[PDB]
Amino acid sequence: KYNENYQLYNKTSPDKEVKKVFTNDKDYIAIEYNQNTNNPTFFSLIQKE
Amino acid sequence: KLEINKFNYNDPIDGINVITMRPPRHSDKINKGKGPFKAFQVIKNIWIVPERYNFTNNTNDLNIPSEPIMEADAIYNPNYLNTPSEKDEFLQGVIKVLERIKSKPEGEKLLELISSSIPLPLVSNGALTLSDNETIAYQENNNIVSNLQANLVIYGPGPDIANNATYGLYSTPISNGEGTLSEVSFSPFYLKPFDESYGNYRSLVNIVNKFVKREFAPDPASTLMHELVHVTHNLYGISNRNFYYNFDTGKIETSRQQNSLIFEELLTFGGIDSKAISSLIIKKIIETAKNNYTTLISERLNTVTVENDLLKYIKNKIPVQGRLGNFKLDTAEFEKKLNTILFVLNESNLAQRFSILVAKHFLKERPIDPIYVNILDDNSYSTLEGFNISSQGSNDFQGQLLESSYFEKIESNALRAFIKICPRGCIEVENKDLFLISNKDSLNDINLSEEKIKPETTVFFKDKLPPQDITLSNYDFTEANSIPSISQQNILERNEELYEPIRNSLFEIKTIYVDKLTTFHFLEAQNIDESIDSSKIRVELTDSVDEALSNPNKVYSPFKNMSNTINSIETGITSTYIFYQWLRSIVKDFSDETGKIDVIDKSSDTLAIVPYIGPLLNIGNDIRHGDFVGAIELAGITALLEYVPEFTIPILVGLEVIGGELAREQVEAIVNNALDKRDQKWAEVYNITKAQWWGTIHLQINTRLAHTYKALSRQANAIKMNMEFQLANYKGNIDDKAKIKNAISETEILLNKSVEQAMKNTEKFMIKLSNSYLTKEMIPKVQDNLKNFDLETKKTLDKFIKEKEDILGTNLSSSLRRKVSIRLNKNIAFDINDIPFSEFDDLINQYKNEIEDYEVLNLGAEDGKIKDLSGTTSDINIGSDIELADGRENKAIKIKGSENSTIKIAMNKYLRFSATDNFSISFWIKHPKPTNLLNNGIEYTLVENFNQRGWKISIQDSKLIWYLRDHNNSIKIVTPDYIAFNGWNLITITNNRSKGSIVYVNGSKIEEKDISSIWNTEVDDPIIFRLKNNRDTQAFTLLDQFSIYRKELNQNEVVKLYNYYFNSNYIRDIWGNPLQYNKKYYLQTQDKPGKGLIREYWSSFGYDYVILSDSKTITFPNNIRYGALYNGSKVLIKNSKKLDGLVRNKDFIQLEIDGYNMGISADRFNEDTNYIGTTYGTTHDLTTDFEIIQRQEKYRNYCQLKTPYNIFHKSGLMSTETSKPTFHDYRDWVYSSAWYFQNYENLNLRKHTKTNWYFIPKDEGWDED
Amino acid sequence: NKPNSLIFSENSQALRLSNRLNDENYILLDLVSKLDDEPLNIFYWEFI
Known part of the structure; x- marks a missing residue:
């Protein structure tokens, strides 16, 4: 569904969730392996209309 | 990150990258005196040694063995790699292969993994230290100077200079998880081609290649990348030789006599062969490797108090966790990594990532003579692409073919391996033709046991x-590619025994005494020696094997119908017409007669038995002489196979548990683990019997298929011998043989296509038989022993709960007892989704491999631009007055017929159809209703490839004409009518040059005409989409998905292609377009044509009834009356939220006529037939939400309108009844008809007319004015 | 073949998970590469 938040996985590493990375100025989305702190991020599919 | 060092054999010895090693197997007595060899470190811990591998007893000798061997493809050349020039060439070739592997990311990952995963080093004073199991000794003057780290040593080939092999170094470290050094012997120049002639139904080469033979040569990158997986297995302590197929069977006495095949070997190759044995060997290896690595970490890795670089290597290789002094093997990622090593990393997957063709079978049914290729010549082999250097078009495994002029063929000096079946001139049949039957006790003596089931x-x-x-x-x-090399001087001895692989058995010459003609007799009866000259000798096809056996001229043909058209024709044919007629008759008879199948209709079996295997192969003559389809019924497999194994499996002792001062939370885990272990034991015994089936039952099926291919190919070559003899006697004319020779070449191509179709049928019906045997007659034997083991386990566990019950507690005891009783009383289902050959694999891509594979043109519209959707050609130029209009699924091509709306496709090699090339043309058409009478009787073309010779699709008055014109002959096929009714019609014309041209409209056959007299329809003029010879300048036509295929689609594929266009569940209006959500439509019933929907208001009842309006008719220009479509009021389909999409199969809609929503009453007022009203009039409440459905076929241009179920009215299908309920006039009232919906599927097709609705759009091309 | 997965494809390039570099598999666009007539498992993503 549009405008509904889900958790994103790569279908290859379902144990690790795609999480946005903000520790650097160039923010991006990556799968992290340290996992010292767990905080999920939600991805929702949105179109212009 | 890892660097490949570019070295030359003349480079001076650095001592760190170029050394003179002492061979790691120097302790063996056969290797005494073999001096140091030059070695070049190509990658960190990977060394290339350009010397012949002669260090094991298997490869001790390099000469010709002077005795037949068990391998058909072998080259023996002792004086190879004996000179510095050959050594330099070999070193450069190996470096080129390695940098070809490194080019792709997968190969780079594999090379990093090999260079990083070192064997487990020894412990000394708390520090990890290297041993001779991981180091090579660089030596001068009989004195070891430095031990350099080496995870892998690459030599040249062994005795067989075309063979590849991987060997370990020490016996125990290979299997106990320690890991060991590996030695890989391979030649990158000498190759062993594989004959892929009947395995892959997918096109392995180009469609217009004119490929005579589908014999490919392997890629040296993939040949080496196979041995890299074995190196990884050795480095991780994974290889176990206990799972092997013993191919030594003496009872059948007709066995291929091959060396024992390790299950690790098929797992490494991957593909079809691995799927039979994948789960068993992978599960066993992972289960034992977890224990081995846990023990190693517990006793060795935990006794390390030094942080040397070897510790970094080990921590990266083994996914341990914890801290120094406490290391624990984390089972999750360790199991995942082991699965990746075994399952993911194999030859087939890596080769497919490298775009390289593989054999699809590790076993060689048709071994080919090994060849020689100079990969250093960049014109032929390139590190970026490989053999298939994409140039002026994608090769798609085209450079792999062994006729590519750089694959230098070599005559084989290996002695022939034959068995003499010499009954009482007696046959000598090659070893490669014998049945491949693995011994039935190959998987016996296995462990099939587990220790006491503990917690965790x-x-x-x-x-x-x-x-x-x-x-x-x-x-x-990156962690392990930054670690340098140690190169210590003194190493730990690690006194262990050398790993000597299985010494290959010697082939023995044995003779067989049989009392009846065997299948090998039948194959050899269909053979003629190449010493027989095609001219001066006419090979007359016969029907008796005995005559063909003795007389070299004649050939045995069980077809007994080619022999009529092959023989009986006078030699010295006087005309090319006769040599074309005979030549097409040959093609037709061979194609029609090898396609003979018998579809017996036992449910869920439905064997499509081809009967001609009966006399082609002496199979079913013993059980029922003269009948093969009947012989299959009596015995499905016993007749088809020469050996029913009557298998057996070990006694399967029941499992047990530990005894001690346990706890509740862990004895519960013990019970759960025992249940899981029982489940895995059931699955493991099922996998064992599946592996036995594959070894003994399926390999016989594969060799039967190989025998069938031999028989059919020799039938085809006998036909070719006769054709070329006939050409050698062309007495009719002089110097006109060239065209006849091209005709014969194309005919041989057609014969090969018929042979491959026949083999597809044969494989299709044999694979099903073998799978049925496995599932029906094999598992039930196992289930009895498995049930006994399960009962023993249940007894042991239930006794384990009577004790320790107090520790559990009464509730947990009850739950555990219930779980044990329920679970350990059933039968665990056999999971066959991973079976090697399955129908689902053959059906999931049926449309891709049977229809879309042969598409050479598909003219459509994408993103608002007209283009070839297939991508074969791009020189399609369209006129300035061509437009794109709304069409069937996406915009449609609209030819305005103004003589400037010309589309033309410059003809290329894909669209050039020769005399013998079958072809099909499928396109959607929407032809407007003729609005004026000035074009009747004037035939005008629609799409023509015509230069007073060729094909032409034209449109006469509402009839579509398909025309072929040869130099003298022609065909004209006319579709009936209704082309000009403004409806989307799919016309598909299939031309089988041998039999006839068939025209289907909307998937239904119209007419078939003989095309056997038409020969050349090829002209170089572009395929022209135009409306020339049209007297109307405003006349147009919508075209969509005009596609051309290079095969004749039969009725099944035609109806499949017609379903494909309705894959989506859209609702179609009368024209055939999808139904939208904000467009106003005229609404009419299939019954009572010409009447649209209107409303009338009843003030006494306060109800706005929807009623079919007064009928009206339209007059055609040809003075034929038809029911009007634009009648009544325009209803507007809507949604509860105005989605503005396309209507689907079961969407919930809201019809809005004249701005007022339509619906059924929501109270008890209207209990008589549930008349449908509108929101006009607020006295009664309505339930507006309708539901469009299509209960009939998806492509129908009408839809049913199911009414909602409110509590007052049952759900019904919107219909109409003609009545006069009260004093108002006699009308047609629309009502929900709750009765039709309930009994819809029982009604006949005539009553369904009442419920259908058309939803007429106002569309240009149909207009009543 | 895998019905509970999505491919975020732009032109001929689909979203992909890069190689591990610093314990972070950052996501990058890569040209779609097939395996048995279907792309790799990496290009497929799942929503939970």
Whole structure:
């Protein structure tokens, strides 16, 4: 569904969730392996209309 | 990150990259005196040694053995790699292969993994130290100077200079998880081609290649990349030789006599062969490797108090966790990594990532003579692409073919391996033709046992692992590619025994005495020696094997119908017409007669038995002489196979548990683990019997298929011998043989296509038989022993709960007892989704491999631009007055017929159809209704490839004409009518040059005409889409998905292609377009044509009834009356939220006529037939939400309108009844008809007319004015 | 073949998970590469 938040996985590493990375100025989305702190991020599919 | 060092054999010895090693097997007595060899470190811990591998007893000798061997493809050349020039060439070739592997990311990951995963080093004073199991000794003057680290040593080939092999170094470290050094022997120049002639139904080469033979040569990159997987297995302590197929069977006495095949070997190759044995060997290896690595870490890795670089290597290789002094093997990622090593990393997956063709079978049914290729010549082999250097078009495994002029063929000096079947001139049949029957006790003597089921056993769950990762996105190697090489001087001895692989058995010459003609007799009866000259000798096809056996001229043909058209024709044909007629008759008879199948209709079996295998192969003559289809019924497999094994499996002792001062939370885990272990034992015994089936039953099926291919190919070559003899006697004319020779070449191509279709049928019906035997007659034998084991386990566990019950507690005891009683009383189903050959694999891509594979043109519209959707050609130029209009699924091509709306496709080699090339043309058409009478009787073309010779699709008055014109002959096929009714019609014309041209409209056959007299319809003028010879300048036509295929689609594929266009569940209006959500439509019933919907208001009842309006008719220009479509009021389909999409199969809609929503009453007022009203009039409440459905076929241009179920009215299908309920006039009232919906599927097709509705759009091309 | 997965494809390039570099598999666009007539498992993503 549009405008509904889900958790994103790569279908290859379902144990690790795609999480946005903000520790650097160039923010991006990556799968992290340290996992010292767990905080999920939600991805929702949105179109212009 | 890892660097490949570019070295030359003349480079001076650095001592760190170029050394003179002492061979690691120097302790063996056969290797005494073999001096140091020059070695070049190509990658860190990987060394190339350009010397012949002659260090094991298997490869001790390099000369010709002077005795027949068990391998048909072998080259023996002792004086190879004996000179510095050959050594330099070999070194450069190996470096080129390695940098070809490194080019792709998967190969880079594999090379990093090999260079990083060192064997487990020894412990000394708390520090990890290297031993001779991991180091090579660089030596001068009979004195070892430095031991350099080496995970892999690459030599030249062994005795067989075309063979590849991987060997370990020490016996125990290979299997106990320690890991060991590996030695890989391979030649990158000498190759062993594989004959892929009947395995892959997918096109392995180009469609217009004119490929005589589909014999490919392997890629040296993939040949080496096979041995890299074995190196990884050795380095991780994975290889176990206990799972092997013993191919030594003496009872059948007709066995291929091959060396024992390790299950690790098929797992490494991958593909079809691995799927039969994948789960068993992988599960066993992972289960034992977890224990081995846990023991190693517990006793060795935990006794390390030094942080040397070897510790970094080990921590990266083995996914341990914890701290120094306490290391624990984390089972999750360790199991995942082992699965990736075994399952994901294999020859087939890596080769497919490298775009390289593989054999699809590790076993060689048709071995080919090994060849020689100079990969150093960059014109032929390139590190970026490989053999298939894409140039002026994608090769798609085209450079792999062994006729590519750089694959230098070599005559084989290996002695022939034959068995003499010499009954009482007696036949000598090659070893490669014998049946491949593995011994029935090959998997006996296996362990099939487990220790006491303790807590935290954590049995391996292959189904809980994440899916495949071919690229290995995880497992970074930057940590281990920055570690330098140690190169210590003194190493730990590690006194262990050398690993000597199985010494290959010697082929023995044996003779067989049989009392009746065997299948090998039947094959050899269909053979003629190449010493027989095609001219001066006419090979007359016969029907008796005995005559063909003795007389070299004649050939045995069980077809007994080619022999009529092959013989009986006078030699010295006087005209090319006769040599074309005979030549097409040959093609037609061979294609029609090898396609003979018998579809017996036993449910869920439905064997499509081809009967001609009966006399082609002496199979079913013993059980029922003269009948083969009947012989299959009596015995499905016993007749088809020469050996029913009557298998057996070990006694399967029941499992047990530990005894001690346990706890509740862990004895419960013990019970759960025992249940899981029982489940895995059931699955493991099922996998064992599946492996036995594959070894003994399926390999016989494969060799039967090979025998069938031999028989059919020799039938085809006998036909070719006769054709070329006939050409050698062309007495009719002089110097006109060239065209006849081209005709014969194309005819041979057609014969090969017929042969491959016949073999597809044969394989299709044999694979099903073998799978049925496995599932029906094999598992039930196992289930009895498995049930006995299950009962023993249940007894042991239930006794384990009577004790320790107080520790559990009464509730947990009750739950555990219930779980044990329920679970350990059933039968665990056999999971066959991973079976090697399955129908689902053959059906999931049926449309891609049977229809879309042969598409050479598909003219459509994408993103608002007209283009070839297939992508074969791009020189399609369209006129300035061509437009794109709304069409069937996406915009449609609209030819305005103004003589400037010309589309033309410059003809290329794909669209050039020769005399013998079948072809099909499928296109959607929407032809407007003729609005004026000035074009009747004037035939005008629609799309023509015509230069007073060729094909032409034209449109006469509402009839579509398909025309072929040869130099003298022609065909004209006319569709009936209704082309000009403004409806989307799919016309598909299939031309089988041998039999006839068939025209289907909307998937239904119209007419078939003989095309056997038409020969050349090829002209170089572009295919022209135009409306020339049209007297109307405003006349147009919508075209969509005009596609051309290079095969004759039969009725099944035609109806499949017609379903494909309705894959989506859209609702279609009368024209055939999808139904939208904000467009106003005229609404009419299929019954009572010409009447649209209107409303009338009843003030006394306060109800706005929907009623079919007064009928009206339209007059055609040809003075034929038809029911009007634009009648009544325009209803507007809507949604509860105005989605503005396309209407689908079961969407919930809201019809809005004249601005007022339509619906059924929502109270008890209207209990008589449930008349449908509108929101006009607020006295009664309505339930507006309708539901469009299509209960009939998806392509129908009408839809049913199911009414909602409110509590007052049952759900019904919107229909109409003609009545006069009260004093108002006699009308047609629309009502919900709750009765039709309930009994819809029982009604006949005539009553369904009442419920259908058309939803007429106002569309240009149909207008009543 | 895998019905509970999505491919975020732009032109001929689909979203992909890069190789592990610093314990972070950052996501990048890559040209779609097939395996048995279907792309790799990496290009497929799942929403939970």
